Design a protein around this ligand. Structure first.
Ligand SMILES: CCCCCCO[C@@H]1O[C@H](CO)[C@@H](O)[C@H](O)[C@H]1O
Ligand SMILES: CCCCCCO[C@@H]1O[C@H](CO)[C@@H](O)[C@H](O)[C@H]1O
Lengths: 99, 424, 49, 43, 441, 146, 43
């Protein structure tokens, strides 16, 4: 049932109500910080504004008008290619550290 | 003891233009180099310094090997990877024990045919341009020779081996990609090997170095102009070079200039010696009794060349040393040249050439350069014959060409007493 | 010249066993260190008690 | 790699003819960079 | 061929000896050029405080003319045949060598024989060189590296001949007389103390005959009361700090006592030193370098450069490192460096030792590249080991080294041993000797 | 210097003089980089003593009475030094200095030796300057008479 | 005095003829330094 429940969960989760994209909510560990540092200017700046807008809404205990909510169908991972490579590089260093 | 092997150099030019040359010496270690026509002369006004950064980026991430792997992998087998550049060529060389050539070759191929020039790695490397340049420029000779080329040519050969300051932090990934794509092509390369079999290098080149290239003034003939650049910096000693256009490497006239270089004096032969047979040195010594150094300067390129002399003296004596040196060359141009002087010069030149291909580094540089310059191999015995063939009149005529030719000059130090070209 | 710099004579401070400049001091190093170690081990045990 | 360069570079010689002898440039320069060895500049 | 078969294909070095004691050694190749020279067991370790600098003074006179070739005649002859004549002096060895076309080997040997036996030493030339040397002393003072290394020897070997610099103190330069020099020469330049070595396109038999022809007159006796023998040199755990805040970077050299030339332990020590390695700001590896010291230094910008070293003398030596850094980075550099020596003593791993072994293999072979490096190896080896050690032997010695051998050998020379320390420049942050000593365990 | 050199015209005009003259007028108004931190008190004293002399000075005033200014000069500027240390005559040489810096715009100046100020020929050059065009006269104009 | 310079200097755009007009140099330069006013460089 993992598509119907998915869209339902997405909305129940509600980060979309603050105008955030899923990757904007990831918990930042060292791999994530490096991935974010590698983002091209436009994606980095977009991320910064979406987060700032969400924090502002959160402070006011408000949410965006429904028509501005991030849509399940339009949310894509902008961070994945960068994060995947950062993890791959680390794993490689770890395998070499064991020799 | 009586050695094995000695074997001969194997040479092979492929249809695409790539040259492969190898010498099996049965040594315990191997030396492989990929020579490319990608020196600084191929940069243009919009991408100056791109080849300098490229020279410093050999260990950045590639499609087949991460930056981390290139460093750890080469070090694991106690190997070496270096990039050497002149105004015309770039040479990527690897060194390792003979059983590990497979490993070094894979990294070499990744570095030269599959670099990724990742945005963040390229940005992080920029500062290195500043460090590398500062180190090189600690040598006044570097200042003077770079300025000499800039003063002599309107383009191409005028470009510096080091990135201009305004470009540091501005060289983009796209410029690096374009530079590799426009110049690292089959017809512009030579794969040279020492202590490696010709078949394996041939195989490697056939399978991984079959590359066609874009555009790649990345062909532009160097246009000699003449001029002078004076760099005042108040150093106790003045460094100066005075040259005129000479001849392209590969021509017979180039040989005359090489012999003239050794008649005048091309470097010391005896530790702390008085350079008794150096014509320029003895001429200056008679008039100047302050410390100084003087030497004939000879640079020969594919489509041009610069010939003259270089001086180092106390600032107040700059004029005296330079004029005395110049006058000495004028006497040669007037025909005052003895046969014994010419034979001695020929001996120094011949012994000097043979000594320069004595080590693997010199050997490789010689073969690689011939491969890119003439796409052929001229053996030592032939070179020595071409040297013996130079006539006393050819030497005199080279001197004349220098004396009457439009000059280029570069000087650095406290220049209060350093003359201008028109005062010579 | 920095070559005019010679270390002053320390013969009035040296332990007897390292007074001969023509002899290696490695033969007494073990004894010289063993003593200090003995002094430190004994202090540690005293304090522990 | 294994062999360190003749002169190691740091960032931030001559007083006699003898020590000045050989310093004058005689050929075009070459610039080298390495993975394991100090960079160099010839002539 | 494999690296192994290639090792067994190097021509064996041929060694002969004349009646007067002179050893003649050569390695034949097919090079149209060669290097031939004379290596001598003479250096400042053989000098006393009265004549320290004598050998270096002689080096200045060696090419200034001989009885057979006065003034610049020797010079003109070398130059006209396109040969190169060079020389060098160290605390234990002195060498004079010529690079020339192989066909000129006879004249090359004659010239060397002439230089080593008939040096003029003209009083006027001696006065000229006196000023040249004084000026060279001033120039050397501007080389922080040379200064710190002379300081390391001065303190590590204080009170012994090894503490002396090669050039000697300036007052000796001002006072050395021809008498002093001829005396030095008659005593040290004897056939039994020399090795005529050559590498390149030549045959041993030809070299030997040329040696018989040109070096037979060389004395091989001396006597009994005047046979300069070497006494062991005591090493002293100590420190010499020349503070000069006016200099931009600090130079520090630290070392423990090494075993000396002849000891088998030098191979394992070379492996260990290869593991720690060398570094400078122009290295492309940076944060990824295998040596922990190198990558820590590069990522944290701890120094402009550093280099491990194993300086060997007859029966002692200096085993350690030298680094150049900013005034605020000295303690950190010393901390990381000592931590690495301790890690090797107690926890060297098989993989890093293998890397060290491969680095050493590459350094050994790449060093013997050309007739000059080979000729020098022949000359020096004959003086130090009394024989040329073949590559196949070096490989066997390197092969025998593993993590266990590295921990044990390093523990033997580094663990809880007193080091000799020399610092020059803005060194307010150079650690106190007690703290450095505690860092040794 | 950094402030002044933010103006490309400064770069070009300083280089122009350095290219045109062998000496004197070839000197820049700004201290060379290698000299920053090296100008000594003695050089400053030397410079003032060789050039701040009576025969090389003029005290000018506007909005002050001539008598007071005259009495000030008489009592406090009654120095000596005469004509002081004049320099060598400027020797025109000619040449070119090209400064590559990749700016979207190129600034360039081309000149030849003209005439010393005070000569009649200098007046001809001043008129020639205005025939060719010596600066705008109308805000955003097309400079129709330049 | 209290008249600040026309342009205040700071240390560590043009896109049209109109705004470029007047920028070409026409006279030798003058360099000025003040106790109370921003430095300036003319022409
Ligand atoms: C100095 C120019 C950059 C050198 C290329 C290496 O770049 C490094 O690669 C690592 C993977 O091992 C990454 O984890 C690290 O973030 C990256 O900066
Ligand atoms: C740590 C090992 C010490 C002994 C190594 C000896 O090694 C042996 O030396 C012989 C003579 O040089 C060679 O002919 C032989 O090939 C080599 O394996």
């Amino acid at each position: 049932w993992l598509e119907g429940i998915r869209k339902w969960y997405y909305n129940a989760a509600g980060f979309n109500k603050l105008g955030l994209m899923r990757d904007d909510t990831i918990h930042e560990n060292d791999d994530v910080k490096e991935a974010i540092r590698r983002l091209p200017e436009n994606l980095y700046d977009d991320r910064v504004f979406r987060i700032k807008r969400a924090l502002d809404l959160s402070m006011r205990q408000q949410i965006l008008p429904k028509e501005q909510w991030t849509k399940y169908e339009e949310d894509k991972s902008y961070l994945e290619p960068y994060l995947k490579e950062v993890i791959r590089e680390r794993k490689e260093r770890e395998e070499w550290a064991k020799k | 003891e009586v050695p094995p092997h000695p074997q001969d150099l194997e040479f092979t030019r492929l249809p695409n233009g790539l040259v492969i040359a190898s010498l099996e010496n049965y040594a315990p270690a191997s030396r492989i180099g990929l020579f490319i026509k990608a020196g600084s002369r191929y940069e243009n006004s919009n991408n100056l310094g791109t080849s300098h950064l490229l020279r410093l980026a050999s260990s950045l991430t590639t499609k087949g090997a991460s930056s981390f792997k290139i460093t750890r992998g080469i070090e694991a087998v106690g190997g070496k990877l270096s990039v050497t550049s002149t105004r015309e060529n770039m040479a990527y060389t690897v060194e390792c024990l003979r059983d590990d050539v497979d490993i070094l070759m894979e990294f070499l191929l990744n570095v030269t045919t599959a670099p990724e020039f990742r945005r963040w790695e390229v940005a992080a490397l920029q500062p290195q341009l500043r460090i590398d340049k500062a180190v090189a420029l600690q040598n006044p000779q570097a200042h003077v020779i770079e300025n000499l080329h800039a003063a002599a040519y309107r383009n191409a050969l005028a470009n510096s081996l080091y990135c201009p300051d305004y470009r540091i932090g501005k060289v983009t990934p796209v410029e690096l990609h374009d530079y590799v794509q426009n110049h690292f092509t089959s017809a512009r390369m030579a794969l040279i090997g020492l202590g490696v079999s010709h078949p394996v290098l041939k195989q490697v080149a056939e399978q991984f170095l079959n590359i066609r290239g874009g555009l790649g003034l990345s062909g532009a003939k160097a246009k000699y102009h003449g001029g002078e650049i004076r760099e005042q910096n108040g150093d106790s000693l003045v460094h100066a070079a005075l040259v005129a256009e000479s001849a392209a490497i590969g021509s017979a006239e180039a040989n005359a200039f090489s012999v003239l270089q050794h008649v005048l004096g091309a470097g010391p032969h005896v530790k702390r010696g008085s350079n008794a047979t150096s014509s320029l040195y003895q001429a200056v010594a008679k008039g100047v009794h302050q410390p100084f150094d003087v030497s004939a300067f000879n640079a020969s390129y594919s489509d041009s060349g610069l010939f003259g002399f270089y001086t180092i003296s106390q600032a107040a004596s700059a004029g005296d040393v330079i004029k005395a040196a110049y006058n000495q060359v004028k006497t040669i141009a007037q025909g005052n040249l003895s046969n014994p002087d010419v034979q001695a010069a020929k001996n120094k030149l011949k012994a000097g050439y043979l000594m320069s291909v004595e080590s693997s580094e010199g050997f490789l540089d010689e073969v690689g350069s011939q491969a890119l310059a003439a796409g052929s191999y001229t053996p030592p015995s032939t070179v020595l014959q071409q040297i013996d063939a130079v006539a006393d009149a050819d030497v005199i005529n080279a001197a004349k060409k220098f004396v009457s030719g439009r000059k280029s000059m570069a000087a650095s130090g406290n220049l209060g007493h350093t003359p201008f070209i028109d005062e010579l | 010249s920095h070559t005019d710099i010679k270390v002053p004579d320390f013969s009035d401070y040296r332990r007897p066993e390292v007074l001969d400049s023509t002899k290696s001091s490695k033969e007494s190093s073990e004894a010289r260190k063993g003593f200090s170690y003995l002094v430190t081990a004994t202090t540690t045990v005293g304090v522990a008690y | 790699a294994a062999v360190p360069a003749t002169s190691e570079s740091p960032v931030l010689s001559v007083l006699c003819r003898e020590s000045l002898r050989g310093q004058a440039a005689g050929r075009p320069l070459v610039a080298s960079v390495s993975l394991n060895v100090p960079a160099s500049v010839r002539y | 061929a494999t690296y192994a078969q290639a090792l067994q294909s190097v021509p064996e070095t041929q060694v002969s000896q004349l009646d007067n004691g002179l050893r003649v050694a050569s390695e034949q190749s097919s090079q149209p050029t060669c290097t031939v020279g004379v290596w001598i067991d003479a250096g400042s370790r053989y000098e006393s405080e009265k004549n320290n600098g004598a050998g270096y003074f002689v080096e200045h006179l060696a090419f200034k003319g001989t009885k057979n070739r006065p003034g610049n005649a020797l010079e003109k002859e070398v130059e006209s045949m396109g040969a190169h004549l060079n020389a060098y002096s160290t605390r234990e060895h002195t060498a004079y060598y010529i690079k020339a076309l192989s066909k000129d080997l006879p004249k090359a040997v004659e010239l060397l024989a002439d230089i080593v036996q008939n040096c003029s030493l003209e009083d006027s030339q001696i006065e000229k060189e006196r000023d040249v040397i004084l000026q060279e002393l001033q120039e050397n003072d501007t080389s922080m590296r040379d200064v710190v290394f002379n300081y390391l020897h001065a303190t590590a070997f204080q009170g012994t001949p090894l503490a002396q610099s090669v050039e000697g103190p300036s007052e000796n330069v001002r006072k050395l007389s021809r008498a002093d020099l001829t005396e030095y020469l008659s005593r040290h330049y004897k056939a039994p103390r020399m090795v005529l070595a050559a590498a390149g396109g030549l045959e041993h038999r030809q070299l030997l005959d040329l040696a018989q022809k040109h070096f037979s007159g060389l004395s091989g006796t001396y006597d009994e009361d005047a046979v300069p023998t070497l006494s062991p040199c005591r090493f002293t755990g100590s420190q010499i700090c020349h503070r000069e805040d006016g200099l931009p970077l600090a130079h520090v050299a630290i070392a423990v006592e090494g075993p000396g030339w002849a000891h088998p332990d030098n191979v394992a020590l070379q492996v260990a030193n290869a593991i720690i390695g060398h570094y400078d700001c122009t290295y492309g590896g940076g944060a990824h370098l295998s040596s922990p010291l190198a990558s820590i230094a590069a990522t944290n910008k701890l120094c402009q450069s550093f280099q491990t070293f194993n300086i060997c003398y007859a029966d002692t030596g200096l085993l350690g490192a030298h680094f150049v850094c900013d005034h605020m980075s000295i303690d950190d550099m010393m901390f990381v460096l000592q931590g690495q020596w301790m890690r090797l003593c107690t926890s060297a791993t098989e993989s890093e030792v293998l890397r060290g072994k491969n680095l050493l293999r590459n350094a050994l072979v790449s060093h013997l590249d050309g007739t000059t490096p080979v000729c020098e190896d022949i000359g020096r080896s004959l003086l130090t080991y009394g024989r040329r050690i073949p590559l196949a032997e070096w490989e066997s010695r390197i092969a025998e080294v593993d993590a266990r051998v590295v921990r044990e050998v390093c523990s033997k020379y580094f663990y809880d041993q007193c080091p000799a320390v020399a610092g020059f420049g803005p060194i307010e942050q150079l650690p106190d000797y007690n703290r450095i000593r505690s860092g040794m365990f």
